[PDB]
Amino acid sequence: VKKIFVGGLSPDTPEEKIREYFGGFGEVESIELPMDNKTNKRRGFCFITFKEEEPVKKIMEKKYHNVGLSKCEIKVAMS
DNA sequence: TAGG
């Protein structure tokens, strides 16, 4: 498996760029930006799985990430 | 920064 846990994202990052940024990274598997309209916790972050393990191999090495407008700390994600 |  290969996932990257992005930490600290804008008020609503569009998986679309995340798809480009990370897509351009390589083969993105999926992008899940969790949002709570009931309490809006401080999770304000996004998860990204790569079909491949390269974007993942590099992502984890990247202290911080910048997606279009959003910029969050990506540490290999865990599901 | 932690979804589901």
Distance A49 CA to B4 C1' (A): 14
Q: Which CATH class is domain A1-79?
A: alpha beta
Q: Which residues of A55-67 are buried (b: 16+ CB within 10 A; e: fewer)?
A: bbeebbeeeebeb
Q: Is the CB of A79 under 7 A from strand B?
A: yes
**CA–CA separation, A49 vs A26, rounded Å?**
11
Q: Is the CB of A41 under 7 A from strand B?
A: yes
DSSP conformation letters of chain A: --EEEEES--SS--HHHHHHHHHHHS-EEEEE----TTT--TT--EEEEESSSHHHHHHTT-SS--BTTB--EEE----
Q: Is the CB of A47 under 7 A from strand B?
A: yes
The answer to whether residues A2 and A52 touch, using CB atoms and an 8 Å cutoff, is yes
Task: Please classify residue A73 by burial: count the beta carbons closer than 10 Å to its beta carbon, then call 0-12 exposed, 13-18 middle and 19+ buried.
Answer: middle
Nucleotide nearest to A36 (CA to C1'): B3
Nearest to A20 by CA among A53, A73, A68: A68
